[PDB]
């Protein structure tokens, strides 16, 4: 009949793929995913808000602050709290840093998943400096919680923005050298141009989000249409793709890195010295000096860490432009100290839904290039 290959969990991420292929050029591929299933939604249902914030930190794991930002803005949207301006600007700066990190890992792991070895090492030296910044800010290497609902917790120490300025200059030169290395590299252009075309009608019906909508025509940015924070005050532009190519989508990711450099530059130049957290002791914990020499601050610290703050009853769905796309969180909260049911819209899940139309008329090396060309981490796809 036809060859029903079973690509197991070995490395060409981690999945299982059963492809009923015709003859080096396929027929019917089915991704069996769910191998990395953990039980995040049931665990958040049996825990509180502040305690189950790290589940939202690590359900996606390459992006590490946009997922925190999405859950914290879900809770701050439901709880009716505007965060202070310096918290909003630090949240914007770290959103752009995490965006730069996720796009550069997607570029390098797509290059290594094809087989090119060296810009992986170059840009991972750059991402080692990124993790040095995360270490100095929070204390963690990767999984900095750091974003409480109620603003940024424990603001950045003195002597950081100069290092971010130096990193901005050197990283602009390094991404220019990446475009020098690849990108009009002839064999790589031969590797990926005409594979995985996506009609914009199918991009809307199959529910593609983020970079796929940029590549397949239609102009759609959450940062431009629905400013959920101080993005309306920083000036940037989004790149759009003419043809539905993979090469086009690569160019779009590189130019989103470059626009992240612009937003980091303006955010450094326009920092207000407002405050760390909100002006409400019943949501954010009070600082430790007032805790020690104050009665009400000790009472609010004690109850706010045992019971937690309550949330008024209601349901909300917010979604922010994570580097993979519209990362969505839908909270349903009975009026209590625990959420009733949370659910996560994953752009990687929505992109992996259309794998049939992205790999109908191509070969299997192009199937590996299609799996690589969408920033799919297989921990977020699981929910």
């Amino acid at each position: 009949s036809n060859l029903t290959l079973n690509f197991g969990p070995q490395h060409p991420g981690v999945l299982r793929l059963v492809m009923e292929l015709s003859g080096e050029m396929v027929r019917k591929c089915d991704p069996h995913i769910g191998l990395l299933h953990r039980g995040t939604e049931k665990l958040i249902e049996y825990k509180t808000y502040l305690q189950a914030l790290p589940y939202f930190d690590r359900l996606d794991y390459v992006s590490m602050m946009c997922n925190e930002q999405a859950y914290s803005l879900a809770v701050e949207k439901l709880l009716n709290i505007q965060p202070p301006p310096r918290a909003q600007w630090i949240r914007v700066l770290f959103g752009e840093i995490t965006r730069l990190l996720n796009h550069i890992m997607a570029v390098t792991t797509h290059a290594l998943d094809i087989g090119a070895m060296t810009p992986f090492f170059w840009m991972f030296e750059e991402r080692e400096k990124m993790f040095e910044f995360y270490e100095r800010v929070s204390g963690a290497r990767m999984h900095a919680a750091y974003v409480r609902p109620g603003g940024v917790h424990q603001d950045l120490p003195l002597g950081l923005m100069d290092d971010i300025y130096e990193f901005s200059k050197n990283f602009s030169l390094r991404i220019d050298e990446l475009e020098e290395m690849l990108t009009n590299n002839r064999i790589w252009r031969n590797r990926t141009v005409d594979i995985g075309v996506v009609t914009a009608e199918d991009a809307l019906n199959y529910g593609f989000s983020g970079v796929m909508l940029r590549g397949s025509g239609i102009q759609w940015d959450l940062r431009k249409t629905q400013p959920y924070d101080v993005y309306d005050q920083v000036e940037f532009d989004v790149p759009i793709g003419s043809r539905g190519d993979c090469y086009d989508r690569y160019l779009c990711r590189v130019e989103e890195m470059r626009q992240s450099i612009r937003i980091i530059s303006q955010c450094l130049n326009k920092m207000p010295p407002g405050e760390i957290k909100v002006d409400d002791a019943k949501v954010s914990p009070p600082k430790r000096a007032e805790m020690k020499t104050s009665m009400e601050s000790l009472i609010h610290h004690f109850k706010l860490y045992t019971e937690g703050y309550q949330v008024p009853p209601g349901a909300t769905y917010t979604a922010i432009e994570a580097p993979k796309g519209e990362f969505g969180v839908y909270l349903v909260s009975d009026g209590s100290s625990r959420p009733y049911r949370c659910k996560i819209k994953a752009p990687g899940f929505a992109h992996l839904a259309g794998l049939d139309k992205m790999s109908k008329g191509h070969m299997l090396a192009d199937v590996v290039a299609i799996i690589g060309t969408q920033d799919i981490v297989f921990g977020e796809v699981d929910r």
């Binding site: 003195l158 950081l160 923005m161 200059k169 220019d176 475009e179 470059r258 450099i261 450094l268 920092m271």
Partner: peptide, 23 residues
Amino acid sequence: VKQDMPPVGGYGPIDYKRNLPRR
């Protein structure tokens, strides 16, 4: 007083343009 971290009068420019020599 206050001892936050603001920039010192504004930082310099950071380039954001694709640079190629086309040699």
